[PDB]
Amino acid sequence: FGHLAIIFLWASSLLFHVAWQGNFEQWIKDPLHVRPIAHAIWDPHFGKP
Amino acid sequence: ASFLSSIFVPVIGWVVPIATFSFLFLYIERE
């Protein structure tokens, strides 16, 4: 039951990080050229380029 | 509410391993 509930907590973060940070509703309009989005980066170590 | 990244990522980057390692080091070295 512990490994089974990791799987549903894993699959829920696929739904939540797409609903909140991805472009699913913008991907419906043209799936052949709109390029999907998994999640967003918050990396402090990034430079501006 | 994209400001939650500024408060969850440093906690999981810094606070979560510091709280975990300081628990486990005192637990494995415990007579």
Partner: peptide, 30 residues
């Protein structure tokens, strides 16, 4: 995207498996 309100509902609901995972992982012994 989803509204700013709905993110906080997802965080509070996520404490319910977060509490139950702490109960299961300590019922399985130390």
């Amino acid at each position: 995207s989803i509204s700013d309100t709905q993110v906080y509902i997802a965080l509070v609901v996520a404490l319910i498996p977060g509490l139950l995972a702490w109960r299961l992982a300590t019922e399985l012994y130390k």
